[PDB]
Amino acid sequence: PSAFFLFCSEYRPKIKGEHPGIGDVAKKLGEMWNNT
DNA sequence: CGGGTTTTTGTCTGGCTTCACACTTGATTTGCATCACTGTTTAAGACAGGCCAGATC
């Protein structure tokens, strides 16, 4: 388990309740993990 | 001989199932190359001069 490991799923529902899909949901989550 | 009785298949539309699989991104494993290092000559056999020594005219 790494940062993105426990960051792609722990914050997954925060976009999965908006994005039905499951790449596009965590996609912008990767961008907000990269910005920081 | 061609026609007929077995094994073997297509076959139903439903709901079921396990699981491959989309889509990132870094932390691991795994593959395959490199790398620095080691052994520390002869031994038979052919041919040639050359020196010497004994033979011969």
Distance A20 CA to B43 C1' (A): 87
Judge whether residue A27 contacts strand B, using its CB and a 7 Å cut-off.
yes
Break positions in chain A: residue before each gap, C to N over 2.5 angstroms: 21
Method: cryo-EM
State this model's resolution in angstroms: 3.3
Question: Which residue pairs from A4-13 have beta carbons closer than 8 angstroms and sit at least 24 positions apart in sequence?
Answer: A4/A30, A4/A33, A7/A33, A8/A33
From the list A33, A36, A35, A34, the residue with the least C-alpha distance to A6 is A33
- Which nucleotide comes closest to A3 if you measure CA to C1'? B26
